[PDB]
Coordinates of N, CA and C and ligand atoms in Angstrom, one line a residue:
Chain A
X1 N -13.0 -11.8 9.2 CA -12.0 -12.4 8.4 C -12.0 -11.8 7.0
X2 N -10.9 -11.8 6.0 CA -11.0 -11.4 4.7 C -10.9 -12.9 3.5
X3 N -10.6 -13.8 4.2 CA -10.6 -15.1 3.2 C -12.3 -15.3 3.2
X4 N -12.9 -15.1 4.3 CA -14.8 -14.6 4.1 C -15.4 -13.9 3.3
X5 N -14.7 -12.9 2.3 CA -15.1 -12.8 0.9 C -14.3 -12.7 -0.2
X6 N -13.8 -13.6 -0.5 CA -13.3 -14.4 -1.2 C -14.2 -14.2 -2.8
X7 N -13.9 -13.7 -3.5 CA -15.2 -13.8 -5.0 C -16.1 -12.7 -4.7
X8 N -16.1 -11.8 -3.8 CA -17.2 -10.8 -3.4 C -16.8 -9.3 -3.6
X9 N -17.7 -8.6 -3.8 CA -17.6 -6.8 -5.0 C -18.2 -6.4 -3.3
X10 N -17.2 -5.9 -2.5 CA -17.7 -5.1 -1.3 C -17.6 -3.4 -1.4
X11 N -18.7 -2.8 -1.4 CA -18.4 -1.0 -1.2 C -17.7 -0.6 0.3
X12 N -17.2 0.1 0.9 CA -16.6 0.2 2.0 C -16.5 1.8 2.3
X13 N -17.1 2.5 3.3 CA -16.9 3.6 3.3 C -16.2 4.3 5.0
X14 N -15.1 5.4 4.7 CA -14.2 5.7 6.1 C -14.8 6.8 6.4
X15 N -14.6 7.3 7.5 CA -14.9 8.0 8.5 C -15.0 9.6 7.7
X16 N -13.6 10.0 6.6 CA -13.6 11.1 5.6 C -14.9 11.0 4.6
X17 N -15.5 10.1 4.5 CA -16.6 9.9 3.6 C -16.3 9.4 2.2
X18 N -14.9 9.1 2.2 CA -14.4 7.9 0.9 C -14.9 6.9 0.5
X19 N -14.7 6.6 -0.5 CA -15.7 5.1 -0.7 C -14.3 4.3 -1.5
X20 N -14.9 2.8 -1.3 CA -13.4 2.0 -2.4 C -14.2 0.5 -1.7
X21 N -14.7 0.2 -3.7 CA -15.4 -1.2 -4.0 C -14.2 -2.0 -4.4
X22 N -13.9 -2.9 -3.4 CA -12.9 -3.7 -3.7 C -13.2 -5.0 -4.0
X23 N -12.9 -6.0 -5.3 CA -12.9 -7.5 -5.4 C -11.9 -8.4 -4.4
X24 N -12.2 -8.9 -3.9 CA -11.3 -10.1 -3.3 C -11.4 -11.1 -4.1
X25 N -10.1 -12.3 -4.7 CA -10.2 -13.0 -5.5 C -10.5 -14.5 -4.3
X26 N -10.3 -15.5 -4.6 CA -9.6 -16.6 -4.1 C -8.6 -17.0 -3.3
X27 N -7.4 -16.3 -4.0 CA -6.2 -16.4 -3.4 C -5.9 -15.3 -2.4
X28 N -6.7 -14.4 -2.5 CA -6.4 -13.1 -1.8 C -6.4 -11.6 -2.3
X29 N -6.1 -12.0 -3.6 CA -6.0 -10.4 -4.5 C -7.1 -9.8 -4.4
X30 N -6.8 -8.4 -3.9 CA -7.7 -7.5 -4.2 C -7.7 -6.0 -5.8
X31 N -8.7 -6.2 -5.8 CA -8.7 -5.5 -7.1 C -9.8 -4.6 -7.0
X32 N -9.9 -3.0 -7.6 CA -11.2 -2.8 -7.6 C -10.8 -0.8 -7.5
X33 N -11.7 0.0 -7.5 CA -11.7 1.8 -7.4 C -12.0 2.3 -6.0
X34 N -11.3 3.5 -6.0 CA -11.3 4.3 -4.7 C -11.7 5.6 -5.4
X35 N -13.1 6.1 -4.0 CA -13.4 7.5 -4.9 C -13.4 7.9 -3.5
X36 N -12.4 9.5 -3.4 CA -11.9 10.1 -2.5 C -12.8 11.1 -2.6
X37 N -13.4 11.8 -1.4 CA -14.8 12.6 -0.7 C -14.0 13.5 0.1
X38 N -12.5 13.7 0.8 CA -12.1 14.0 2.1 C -11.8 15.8 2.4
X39 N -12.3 16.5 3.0 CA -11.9 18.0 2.9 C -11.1 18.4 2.5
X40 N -10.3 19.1 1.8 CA -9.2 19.8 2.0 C -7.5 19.0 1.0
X41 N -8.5 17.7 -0.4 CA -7.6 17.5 -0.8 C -8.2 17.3 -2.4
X42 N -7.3 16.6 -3.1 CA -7.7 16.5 -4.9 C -8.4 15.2 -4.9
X43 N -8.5 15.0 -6.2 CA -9.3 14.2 -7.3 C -10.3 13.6 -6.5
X44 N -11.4 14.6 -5.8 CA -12.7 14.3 -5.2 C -13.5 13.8 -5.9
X45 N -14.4 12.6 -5.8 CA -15.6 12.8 -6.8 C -15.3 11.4 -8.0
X46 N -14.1 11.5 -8.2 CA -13.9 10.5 -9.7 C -13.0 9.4 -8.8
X47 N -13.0 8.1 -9.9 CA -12.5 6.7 -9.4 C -11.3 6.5 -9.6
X48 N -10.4 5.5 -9.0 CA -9.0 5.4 -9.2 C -9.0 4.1 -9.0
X49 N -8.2 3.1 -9.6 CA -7.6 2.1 -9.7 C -7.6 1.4 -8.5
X50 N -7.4 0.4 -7.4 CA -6.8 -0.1 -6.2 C -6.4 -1.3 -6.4
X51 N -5.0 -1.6 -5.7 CA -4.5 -3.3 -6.0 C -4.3 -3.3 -4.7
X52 N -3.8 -4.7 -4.4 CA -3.1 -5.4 -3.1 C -3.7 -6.8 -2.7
X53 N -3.7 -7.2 -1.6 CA -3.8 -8.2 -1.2 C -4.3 -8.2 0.5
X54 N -5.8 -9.5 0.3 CA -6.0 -9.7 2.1 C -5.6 -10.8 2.2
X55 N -5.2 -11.3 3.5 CA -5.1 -12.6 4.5 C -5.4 -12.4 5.7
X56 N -6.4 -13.8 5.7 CA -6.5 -13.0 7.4 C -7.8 -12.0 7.8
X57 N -7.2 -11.8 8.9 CA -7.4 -10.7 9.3 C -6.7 -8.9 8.9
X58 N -6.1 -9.2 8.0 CA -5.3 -7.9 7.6 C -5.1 -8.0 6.1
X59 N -5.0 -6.6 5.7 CA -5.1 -6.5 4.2 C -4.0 -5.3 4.0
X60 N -3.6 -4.8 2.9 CA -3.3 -3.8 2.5 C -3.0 -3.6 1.0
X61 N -3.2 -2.3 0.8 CA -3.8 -1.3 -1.0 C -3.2 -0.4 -1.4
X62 N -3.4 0.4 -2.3 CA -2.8 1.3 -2.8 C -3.6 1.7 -4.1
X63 N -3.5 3.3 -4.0 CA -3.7 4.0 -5.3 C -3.0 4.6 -5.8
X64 N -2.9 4.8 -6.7 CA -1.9 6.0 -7.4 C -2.8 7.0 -7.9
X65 N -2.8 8.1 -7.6 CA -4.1 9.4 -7.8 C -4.4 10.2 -9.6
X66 N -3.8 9.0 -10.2 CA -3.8 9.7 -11.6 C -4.8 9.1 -12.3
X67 N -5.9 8.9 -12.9 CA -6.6 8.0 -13.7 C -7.4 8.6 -15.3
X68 N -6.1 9.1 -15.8 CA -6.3 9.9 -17.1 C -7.6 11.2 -16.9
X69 N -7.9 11.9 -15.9 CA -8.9 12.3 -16.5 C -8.1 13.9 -15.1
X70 N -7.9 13.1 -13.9 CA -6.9 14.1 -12.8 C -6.1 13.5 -12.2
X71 N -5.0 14.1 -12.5 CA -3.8 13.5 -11.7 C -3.5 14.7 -10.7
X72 N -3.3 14.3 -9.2 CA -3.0 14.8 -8.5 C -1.2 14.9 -8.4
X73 N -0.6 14.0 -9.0 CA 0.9 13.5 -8.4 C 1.4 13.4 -7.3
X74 N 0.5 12.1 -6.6 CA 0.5 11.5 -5.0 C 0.3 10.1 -5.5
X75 N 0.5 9.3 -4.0 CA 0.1 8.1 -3.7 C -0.3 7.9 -2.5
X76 N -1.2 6.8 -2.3 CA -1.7 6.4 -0.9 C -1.4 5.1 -0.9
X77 N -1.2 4.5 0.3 CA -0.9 3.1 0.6 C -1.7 3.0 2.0
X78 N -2.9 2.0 2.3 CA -3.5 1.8 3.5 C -2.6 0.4 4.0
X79 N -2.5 0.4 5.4 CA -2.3 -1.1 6.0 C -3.3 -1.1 7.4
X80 N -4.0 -2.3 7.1 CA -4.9 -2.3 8.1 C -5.2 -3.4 8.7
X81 N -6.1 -3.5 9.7 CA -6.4 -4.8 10.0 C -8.4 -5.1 10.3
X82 N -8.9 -6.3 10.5 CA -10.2 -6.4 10.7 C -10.7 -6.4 12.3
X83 N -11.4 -5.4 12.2 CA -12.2 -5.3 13.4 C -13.9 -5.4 13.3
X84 N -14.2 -6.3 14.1 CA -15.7 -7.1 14.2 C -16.3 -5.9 14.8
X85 N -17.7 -5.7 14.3 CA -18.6 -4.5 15.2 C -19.8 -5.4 16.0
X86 N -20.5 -5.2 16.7 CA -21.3 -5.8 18.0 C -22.6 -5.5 16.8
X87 N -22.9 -6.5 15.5 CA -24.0 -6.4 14.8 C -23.9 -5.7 13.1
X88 N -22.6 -4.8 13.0 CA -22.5 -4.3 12.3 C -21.2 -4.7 11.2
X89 N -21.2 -6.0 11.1 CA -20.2 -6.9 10.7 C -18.8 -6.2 10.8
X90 N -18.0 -6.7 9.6 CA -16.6 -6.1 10.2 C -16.2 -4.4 9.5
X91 N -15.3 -4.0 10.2 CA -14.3 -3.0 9.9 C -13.0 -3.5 9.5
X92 N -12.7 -2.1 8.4 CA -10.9 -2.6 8.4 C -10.1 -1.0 8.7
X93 N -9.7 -1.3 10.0 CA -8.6 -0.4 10.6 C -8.0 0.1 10.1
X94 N -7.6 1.6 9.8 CA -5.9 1.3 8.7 C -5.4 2.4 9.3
X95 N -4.4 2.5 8.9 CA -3.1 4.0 8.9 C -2.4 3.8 7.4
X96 N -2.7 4.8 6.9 CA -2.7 5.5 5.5 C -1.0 6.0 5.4
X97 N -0.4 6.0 4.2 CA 0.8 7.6 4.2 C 0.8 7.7 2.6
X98 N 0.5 9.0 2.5 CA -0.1 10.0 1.3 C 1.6 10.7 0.9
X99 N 2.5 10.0 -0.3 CA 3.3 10.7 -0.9 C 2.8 11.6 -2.1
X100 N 3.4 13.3 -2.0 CA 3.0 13.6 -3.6 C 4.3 14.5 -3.4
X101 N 4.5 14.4 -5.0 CA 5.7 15.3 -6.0 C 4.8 16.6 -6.3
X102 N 4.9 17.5 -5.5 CA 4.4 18.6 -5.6 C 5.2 20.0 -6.2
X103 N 4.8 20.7 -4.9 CA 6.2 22.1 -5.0 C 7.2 21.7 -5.0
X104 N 7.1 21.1 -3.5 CA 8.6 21.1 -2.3 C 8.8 19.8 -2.5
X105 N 8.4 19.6 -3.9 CA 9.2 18.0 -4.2 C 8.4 17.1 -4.2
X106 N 9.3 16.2 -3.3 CA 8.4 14.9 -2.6 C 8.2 15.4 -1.1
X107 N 6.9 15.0 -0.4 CA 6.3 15.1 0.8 C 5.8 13.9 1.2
X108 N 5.4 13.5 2.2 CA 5.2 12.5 2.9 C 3.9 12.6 4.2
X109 N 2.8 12.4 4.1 CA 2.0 12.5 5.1 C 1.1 10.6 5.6
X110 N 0.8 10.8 6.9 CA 0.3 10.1 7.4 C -1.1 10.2 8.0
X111 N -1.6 9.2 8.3 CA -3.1 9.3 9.4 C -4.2 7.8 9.3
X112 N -4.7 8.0 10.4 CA -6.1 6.5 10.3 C -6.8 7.4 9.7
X113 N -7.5 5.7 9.0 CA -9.1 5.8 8.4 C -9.1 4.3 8.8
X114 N -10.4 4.7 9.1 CA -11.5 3.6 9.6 C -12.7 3.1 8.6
X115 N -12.7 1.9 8.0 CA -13.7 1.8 6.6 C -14.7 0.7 7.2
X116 N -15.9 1.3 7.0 CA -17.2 0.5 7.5 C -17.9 -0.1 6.4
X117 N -18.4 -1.4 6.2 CA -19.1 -2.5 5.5 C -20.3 -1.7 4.9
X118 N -20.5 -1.5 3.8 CA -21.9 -1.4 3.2 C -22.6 -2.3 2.6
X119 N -23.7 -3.5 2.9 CA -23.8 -4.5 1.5 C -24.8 -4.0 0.7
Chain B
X1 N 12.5 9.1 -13.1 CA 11.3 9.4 -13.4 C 10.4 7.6 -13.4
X2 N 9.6 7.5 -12.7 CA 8.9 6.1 -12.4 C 8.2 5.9 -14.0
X3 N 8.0 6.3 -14.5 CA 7.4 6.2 -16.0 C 8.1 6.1 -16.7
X4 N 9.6 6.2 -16.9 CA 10.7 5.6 -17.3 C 11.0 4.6 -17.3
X5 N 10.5 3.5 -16.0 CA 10.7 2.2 -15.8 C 9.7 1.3 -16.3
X6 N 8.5 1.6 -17.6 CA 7.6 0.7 -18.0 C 8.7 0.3 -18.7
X7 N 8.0 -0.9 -18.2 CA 8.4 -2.6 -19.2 C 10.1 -3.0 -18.6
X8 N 10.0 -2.6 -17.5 CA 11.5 -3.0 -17.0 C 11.3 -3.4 -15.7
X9 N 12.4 -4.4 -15.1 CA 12.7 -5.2 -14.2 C 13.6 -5.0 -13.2
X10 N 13.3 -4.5 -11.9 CA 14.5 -3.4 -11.6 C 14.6 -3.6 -9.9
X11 N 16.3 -3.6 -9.3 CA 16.3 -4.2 -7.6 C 16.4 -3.0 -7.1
X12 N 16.0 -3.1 -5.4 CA 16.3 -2.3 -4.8 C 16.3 -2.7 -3.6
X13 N 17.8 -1.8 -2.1 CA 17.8 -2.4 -1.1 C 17.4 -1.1 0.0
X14 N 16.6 -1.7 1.0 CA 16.5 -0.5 1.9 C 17.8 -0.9 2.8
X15 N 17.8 0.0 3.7 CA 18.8 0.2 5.1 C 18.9 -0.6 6.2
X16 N 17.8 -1.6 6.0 CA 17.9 -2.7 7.0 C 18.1 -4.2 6.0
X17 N 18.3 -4.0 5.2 CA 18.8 -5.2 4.3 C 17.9 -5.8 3.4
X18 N 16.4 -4.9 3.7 CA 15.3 -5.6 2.6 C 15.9 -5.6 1.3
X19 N 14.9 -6.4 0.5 CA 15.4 -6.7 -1.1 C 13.8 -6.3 -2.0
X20 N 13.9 -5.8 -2.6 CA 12.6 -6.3 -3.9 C 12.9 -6.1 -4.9
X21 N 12.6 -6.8 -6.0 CA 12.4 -6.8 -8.1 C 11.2 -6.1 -7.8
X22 N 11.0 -5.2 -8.3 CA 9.8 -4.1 -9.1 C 9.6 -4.2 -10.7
X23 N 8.4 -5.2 -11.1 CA 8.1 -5.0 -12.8 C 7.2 -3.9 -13.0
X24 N 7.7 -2.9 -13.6 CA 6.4 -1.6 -14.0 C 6.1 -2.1 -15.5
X25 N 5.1 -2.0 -15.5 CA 4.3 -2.4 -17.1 C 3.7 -1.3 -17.8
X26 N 3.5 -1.2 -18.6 CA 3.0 -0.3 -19.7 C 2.1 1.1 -18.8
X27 N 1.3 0.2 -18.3 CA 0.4 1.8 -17.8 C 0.2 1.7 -16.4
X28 N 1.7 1.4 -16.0 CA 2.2 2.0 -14.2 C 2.1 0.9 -12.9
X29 N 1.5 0.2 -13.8 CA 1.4 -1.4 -12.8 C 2.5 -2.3 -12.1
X30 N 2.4 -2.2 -11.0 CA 4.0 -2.7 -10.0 C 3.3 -4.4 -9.7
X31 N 4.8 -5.2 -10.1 CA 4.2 -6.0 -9.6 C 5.8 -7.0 -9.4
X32 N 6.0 -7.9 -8.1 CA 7.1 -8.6 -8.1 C 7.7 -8.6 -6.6
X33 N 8.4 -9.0 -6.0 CA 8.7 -9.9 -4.6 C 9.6 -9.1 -3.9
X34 N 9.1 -9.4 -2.5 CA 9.6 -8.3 -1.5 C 10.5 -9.6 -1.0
X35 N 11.2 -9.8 -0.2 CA 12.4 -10.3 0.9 C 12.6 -9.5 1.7
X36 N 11.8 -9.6 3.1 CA 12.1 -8.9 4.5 C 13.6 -9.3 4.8
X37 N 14.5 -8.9 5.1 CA 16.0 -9.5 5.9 C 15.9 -8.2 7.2
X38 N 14.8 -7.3 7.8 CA 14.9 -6.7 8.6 C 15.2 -7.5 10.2
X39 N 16.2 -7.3 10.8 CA 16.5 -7.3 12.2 C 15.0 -7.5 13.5
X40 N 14.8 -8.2 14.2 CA 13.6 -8.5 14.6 C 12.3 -8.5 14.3
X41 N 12.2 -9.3 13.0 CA 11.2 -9.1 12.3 C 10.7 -11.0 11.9
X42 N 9.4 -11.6 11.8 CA 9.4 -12.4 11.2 C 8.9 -12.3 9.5
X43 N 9.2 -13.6 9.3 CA 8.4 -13.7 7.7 C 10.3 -13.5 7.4
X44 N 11.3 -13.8 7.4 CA 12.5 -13.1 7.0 C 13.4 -14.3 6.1
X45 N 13.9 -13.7 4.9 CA 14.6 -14.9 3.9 C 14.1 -15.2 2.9
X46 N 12.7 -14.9 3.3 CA 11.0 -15.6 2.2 C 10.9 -14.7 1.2
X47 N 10.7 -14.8 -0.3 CA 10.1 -13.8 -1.0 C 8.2 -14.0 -1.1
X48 N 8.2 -12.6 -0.8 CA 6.9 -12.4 -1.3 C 6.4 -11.7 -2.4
X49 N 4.8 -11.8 -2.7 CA 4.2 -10.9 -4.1 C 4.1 -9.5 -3.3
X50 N 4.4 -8.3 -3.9 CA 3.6 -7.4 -3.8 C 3.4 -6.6 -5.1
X51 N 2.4 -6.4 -5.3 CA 1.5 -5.2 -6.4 C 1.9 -4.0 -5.6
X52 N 1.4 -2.9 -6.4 CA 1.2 -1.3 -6.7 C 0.9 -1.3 -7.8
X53 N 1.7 0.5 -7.5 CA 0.8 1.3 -8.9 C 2.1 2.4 -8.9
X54 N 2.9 2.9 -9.8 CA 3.8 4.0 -9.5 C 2.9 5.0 -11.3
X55 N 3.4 6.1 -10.9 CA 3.1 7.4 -11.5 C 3.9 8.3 -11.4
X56 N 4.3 9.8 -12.4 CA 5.2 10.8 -12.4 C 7.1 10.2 -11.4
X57 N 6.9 10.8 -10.2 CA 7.4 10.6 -9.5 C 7.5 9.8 -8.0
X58 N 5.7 9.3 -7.6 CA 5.5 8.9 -6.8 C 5.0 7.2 -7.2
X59 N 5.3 6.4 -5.8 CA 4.8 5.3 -5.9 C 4.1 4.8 -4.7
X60 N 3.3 3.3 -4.6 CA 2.6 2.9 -3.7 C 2.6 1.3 -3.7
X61 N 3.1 0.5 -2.6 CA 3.2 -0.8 -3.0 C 3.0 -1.7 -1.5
X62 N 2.2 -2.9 -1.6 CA 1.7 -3.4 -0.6 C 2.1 -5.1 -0.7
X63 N 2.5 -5.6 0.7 CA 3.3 -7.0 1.2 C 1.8 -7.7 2.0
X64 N 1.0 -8.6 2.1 CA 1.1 -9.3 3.1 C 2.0 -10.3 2.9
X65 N 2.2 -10.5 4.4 CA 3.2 -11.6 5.1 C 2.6 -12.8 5.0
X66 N 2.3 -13.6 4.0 CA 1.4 -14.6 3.5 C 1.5 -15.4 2.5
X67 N 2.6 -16.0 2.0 CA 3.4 -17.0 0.8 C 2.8 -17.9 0.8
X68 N 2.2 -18.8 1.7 CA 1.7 -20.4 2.1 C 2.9 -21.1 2.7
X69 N 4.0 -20.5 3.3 CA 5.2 -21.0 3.5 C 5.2 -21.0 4.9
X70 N 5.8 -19.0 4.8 CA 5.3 -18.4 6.6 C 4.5 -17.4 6.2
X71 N 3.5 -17.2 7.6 CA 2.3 -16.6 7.8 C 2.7 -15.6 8.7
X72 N 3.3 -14.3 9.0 CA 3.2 -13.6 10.1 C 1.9 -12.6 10.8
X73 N 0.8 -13.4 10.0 CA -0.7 -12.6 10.5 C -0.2 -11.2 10.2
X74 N 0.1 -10.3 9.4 CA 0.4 -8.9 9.3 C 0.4 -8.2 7.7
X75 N 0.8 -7.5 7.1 CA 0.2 -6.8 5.9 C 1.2 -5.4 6.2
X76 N 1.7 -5.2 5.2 CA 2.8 -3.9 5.3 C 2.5 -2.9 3.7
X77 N 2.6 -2.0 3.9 CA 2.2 -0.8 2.8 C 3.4 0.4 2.7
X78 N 3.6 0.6 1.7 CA 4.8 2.1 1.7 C 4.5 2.6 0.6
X79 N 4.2 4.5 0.6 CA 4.1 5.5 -0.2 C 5.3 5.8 -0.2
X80 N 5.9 6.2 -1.2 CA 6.7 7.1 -1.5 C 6.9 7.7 -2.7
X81 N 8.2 8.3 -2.8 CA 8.4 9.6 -3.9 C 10.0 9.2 -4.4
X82 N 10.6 9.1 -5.9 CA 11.7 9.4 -6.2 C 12.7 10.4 -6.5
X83 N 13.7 10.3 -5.5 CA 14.6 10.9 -5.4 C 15.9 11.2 -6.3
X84 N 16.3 12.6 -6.6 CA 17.9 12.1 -7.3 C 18.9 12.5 -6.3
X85 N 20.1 11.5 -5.8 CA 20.7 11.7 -4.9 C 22.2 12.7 -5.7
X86 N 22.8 13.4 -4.6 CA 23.7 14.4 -5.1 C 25.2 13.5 -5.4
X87 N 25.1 11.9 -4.6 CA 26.0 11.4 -4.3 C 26.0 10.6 -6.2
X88 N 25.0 10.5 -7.2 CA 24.5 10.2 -8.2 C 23.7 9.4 -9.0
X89 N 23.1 8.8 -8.1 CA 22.3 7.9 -8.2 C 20.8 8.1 -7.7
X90 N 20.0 7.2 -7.3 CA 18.5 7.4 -7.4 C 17.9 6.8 -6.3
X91 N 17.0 6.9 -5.7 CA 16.8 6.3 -4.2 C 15.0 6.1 -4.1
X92 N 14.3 5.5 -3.9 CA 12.8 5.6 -3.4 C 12.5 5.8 -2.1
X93 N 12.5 7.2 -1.5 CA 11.8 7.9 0.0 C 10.8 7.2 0.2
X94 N 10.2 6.3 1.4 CA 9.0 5.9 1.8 C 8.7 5.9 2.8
X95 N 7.2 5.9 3.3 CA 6.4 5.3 4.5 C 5.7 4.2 4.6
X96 N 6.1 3.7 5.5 CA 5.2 2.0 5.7 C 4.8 1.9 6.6
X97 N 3.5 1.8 6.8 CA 2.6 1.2 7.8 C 2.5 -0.6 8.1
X98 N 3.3 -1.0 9.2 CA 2.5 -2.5 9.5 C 1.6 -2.4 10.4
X99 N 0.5 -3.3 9.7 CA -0.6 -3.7 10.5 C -0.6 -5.1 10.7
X100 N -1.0 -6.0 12.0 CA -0.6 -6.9 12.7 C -1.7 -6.7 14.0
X101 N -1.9 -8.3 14.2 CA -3.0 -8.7 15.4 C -2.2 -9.5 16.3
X102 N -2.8 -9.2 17.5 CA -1.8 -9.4 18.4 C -2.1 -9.8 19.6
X103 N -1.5 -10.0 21.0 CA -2.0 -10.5 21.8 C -3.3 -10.4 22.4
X104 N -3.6 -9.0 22.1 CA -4.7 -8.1 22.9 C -5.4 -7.2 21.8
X105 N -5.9 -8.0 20.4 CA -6.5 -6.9 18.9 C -5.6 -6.5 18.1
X106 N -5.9 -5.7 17.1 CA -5.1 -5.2 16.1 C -4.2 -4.5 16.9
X107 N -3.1 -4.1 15.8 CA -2.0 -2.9 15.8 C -1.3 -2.6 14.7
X108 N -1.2 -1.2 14.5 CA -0.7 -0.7 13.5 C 0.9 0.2 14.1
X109 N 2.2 -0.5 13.5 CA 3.5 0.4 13.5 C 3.9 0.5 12.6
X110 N 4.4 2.1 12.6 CA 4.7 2.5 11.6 C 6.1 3.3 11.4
X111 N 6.1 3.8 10.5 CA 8.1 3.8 9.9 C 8.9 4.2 8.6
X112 N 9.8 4.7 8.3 CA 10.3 5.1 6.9 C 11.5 4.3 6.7
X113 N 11.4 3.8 5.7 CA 12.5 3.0 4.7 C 13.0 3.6 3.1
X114 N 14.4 4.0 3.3 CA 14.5 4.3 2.0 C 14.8 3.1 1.2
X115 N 15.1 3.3 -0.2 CA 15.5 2.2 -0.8 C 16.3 2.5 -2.0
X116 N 17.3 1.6 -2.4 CA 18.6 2.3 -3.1 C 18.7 1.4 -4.8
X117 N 18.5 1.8 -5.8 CA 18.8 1.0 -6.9 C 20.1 0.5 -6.6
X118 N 20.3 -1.6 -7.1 CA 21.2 -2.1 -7.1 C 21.0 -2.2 -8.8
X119 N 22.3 -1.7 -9.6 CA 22.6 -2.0 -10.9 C 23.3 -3.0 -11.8
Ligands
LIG1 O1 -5.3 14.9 -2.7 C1 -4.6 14.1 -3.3 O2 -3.3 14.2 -3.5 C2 -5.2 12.7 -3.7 C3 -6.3 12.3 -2.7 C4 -5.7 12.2 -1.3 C5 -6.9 11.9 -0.4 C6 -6.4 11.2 0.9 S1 -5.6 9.6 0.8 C7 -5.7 9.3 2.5 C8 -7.0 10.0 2.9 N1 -8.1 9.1 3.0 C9 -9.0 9.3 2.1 O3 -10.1 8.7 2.0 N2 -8.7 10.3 1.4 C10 -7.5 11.0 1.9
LIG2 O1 7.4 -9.2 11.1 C1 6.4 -9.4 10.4 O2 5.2 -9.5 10.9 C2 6.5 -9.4 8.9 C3 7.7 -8.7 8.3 C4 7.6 -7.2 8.4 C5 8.9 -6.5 7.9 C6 8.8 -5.0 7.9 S1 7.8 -4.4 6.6 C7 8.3 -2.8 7.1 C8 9.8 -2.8 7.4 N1 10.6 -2.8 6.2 C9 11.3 -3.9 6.0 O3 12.0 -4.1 5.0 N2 11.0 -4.7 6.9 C10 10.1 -4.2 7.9

């Protein structure tokens, strides 16, 4: 469940080797930084901003890849849901889509990540 | 240019009849209420909160289906990029992931919505 941390600073790390410590308030708001690890893309290494909201069993976030120091000129948006592990408390499921104003404009990409509980 | 729109209050409709107000704030902060009116969909009529984050040209903004009103157990997410249309006006290109639990575990479907400034 995500109303289960409720007031709690969770680290969470996906399958790319991303990390993103998110607050959950009371009501649901999530607040908190995403630091992107993943092969083959930008602003690796440094933190970025993340908003949104859980209920439930399901959540969903967003970054915007600029945080004064590297802007990529992208966005990411996760929607996910909670999946229980046999000991290894929960997961949150997601499928991602990565817009950036690059060359060829605007682009549009997609894909899962899978983000595992650290306490 | 999404950085054009700090401190302003502004509608837009996708192609299946959704609605949202978008407030951008000083340093790129989205915040303000989605209305699903999509075609077999629940949660529809209801306005909801959703946050982001927009930058340069791209944006990122996230729905749970979760007012205290109706609950449709699900969480929706959309990247995108703005566009200038040749017809003269302005459009936001996106992707949205819904995530949703269901008879038999999570599921994630997913989809593109554009969305059109109403003036
Ligand atoms: O390279 C960029 O334009 C900004 C960072 C993009 C990294 C993507 S976002 C989806 C995927 N999951 C991650 O943890 N990182 C990559
Ligand atoms: O049916 C639900 O579980 C909640 C409503 C989901 C509506 C989706 S969000 C993605 C797509 N774009 C819309 O405007 N409506 C649908």
């Amino acid at each position: 469940d995500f109303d289960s941390l409720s007031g709690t600073s969770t680290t969470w790390v996906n399958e790319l080797g991303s990390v993103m410590t998110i607050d959950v308030d009371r009501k649901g708001g999530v607040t908190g930084y995403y630091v992107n690890n993943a092969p083959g893309t930008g602003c690796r290494g440094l933190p970025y901003d993340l908003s949104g909201h859980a209920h439930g069993s399901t959540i969903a976030f967003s970054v915007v890849w600029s945080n004064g120091i590297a802007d990529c000129r992208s966005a990411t948006s996760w929607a996910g849901y909670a999946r229980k592990t046999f000991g290894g408390g929960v997961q949150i499921v997601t499928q991602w889509s990565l817009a950036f104003v690059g060359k060829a404009g605007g682009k549009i990409e997609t894909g899962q990540n899978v983000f595992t509980y650290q306490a």
